[PDB]
Design a protein that fits this description.
The PDB classes it as fluorescent protein. Keywords: FP, fluorescent protein. The assembly is dimeric. Isolation, Cloning and Biophysical Analysis of a Novel Hexameric Green Fluorescent Protein from a Philippine Soft Coral. Two copies of one chain form a homodimer. Chain A has one domain: Beta Barrel (Green Fluorescent Protein). The first copy, chain A, is mostly beta strands and 220 residues long. The first copy, chain A, has an eleven-stranded mixed barrel. The termini of chain A are far apart. In chain A, a hairpin with a 2-residue loop joins β5 and β6.
Chain lengths: 220, 220
């Protein structure tokens, strides 16, 4: 127990999407070993945000993932020292976001330092017209590369007028300390905005994440 | 009924990979409602194949998917008229495969006509050096686009060595008749070569495939 049953979170995000600068801070709590967490996010500059808040939410810590015992837990092993991750979000209309987060801990509180850059979103697309409703749930594919951990996930925004808008995430997760490396595996996610105000200047955000091998057995 | 509890398969693939021409035929059988199947495949022209057989396996029919009653089964509903699909396989060293399959039915037998083109495999890469061991199991994400069904999946080739070579599959599945369209969902896979002669001129190939929604409940 360096990672406790219950851990708090603090976070600072600096961002810019299609020219628009903003700053968001968050406070929250979760249960690393259950893989659940809840954050309260507050826009401190750049309100009201002229884009879909959904592009931001996965930026706001795989320490909150239920890991089974037969899969080494890359993320919980790197604490107290921590880790950082970097991600590219590639949208099917050629927008991209590049994100970096640096994760630390002190006592029972994680702290994140986040940079968020989005660009080339079409001005009449679903992101810039706030036409998204949520992220679908997902299955991220986890795999070791050059001594560290990668995660790739096919994501999808549910639009009103129930089509989808696809986005591919690739993330490199880098432990500060060397750790027992896991075999290829999956992390199932469901990310959800539970409540927001009109502007999305205040958001309550929840994630459930559960790591696993395939449900399907191997044939002899 | 139409799709029986047991359906036989016959197929014919015409292929080219890095300039090398080949033809493969196969016979076998499966259980469309269990999502299981076995194929016995034979290289008719182009032996010995100079590249990894693994790049071909996913080309060798989502009617072999166990669908739960609460998710419309797009693939079983298109029979007996059939369907076709078109796929890009995009490898991380920028090799690329483009694949087409036309799927038909006679009585208790599916027949496929497959066109496989692969190119830009680097000559010391693991595909042309036959350093691949298998695909990992995967989770394909299914969503409707303009009245048909797309499936995207992050795939990975386990390497003789211990690392992985990533490949992204994008597939359009086009039913030949109007059919009840499913909501966003997931198909889990595990494709496996069970046995092969030494040149892979004979190969016994197995797939297990089960459709579902997220394992994780929503939060209200």
């Amino acid at each position: 127990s360096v990672i406790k049953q219950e851990m708090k979170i603090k976070l600072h995000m600096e961002g810019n999407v299609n020219g628009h600068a903003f700053v968001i801070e968050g406070d929250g709590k979760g249960k690393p070993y259950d893989g659940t967490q809840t954050l309260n996010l507050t826009v401190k500059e750049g309100a009201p945000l002229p884009f879909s808040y959904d592009i931001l939410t996965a930026a706001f810590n795989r320490a909150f993932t239920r890991y089974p015992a037969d899969i080494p837990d890359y993320f919980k092993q790197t604490f107290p020292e921590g880790y950082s991750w970097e991600r590219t979000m590639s949208y099917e209309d050629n927008a991209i976001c590049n994100v970096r987060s640096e994760i630390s801990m002190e006592g029972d509180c994680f702290t994140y330092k986040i940079r968020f850059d989005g660009k080339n979103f079409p001005p009449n697309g679903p992101v810039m017209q706030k036409k998204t409703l949520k992220w679908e749930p997902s299955t991220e594919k986890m795999y070791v590369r050059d001594g560290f951990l990668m995660g790739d996930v096919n994501m999808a925004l549910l639009l009103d007028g129930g089509g989808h808008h696809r986005c591919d995430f690739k993330t490199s997760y880098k432990a500060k300390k060397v750790v027992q490396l896991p075999d290829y595996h999956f992390v199932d996610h469901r990310n959800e905005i539970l409540s927001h105000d009109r502007d999305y200047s205040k958001v309550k955000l929840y994630e459930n994440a559960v790591a696993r091998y395939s449900l399907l057995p191997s044939q002899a």
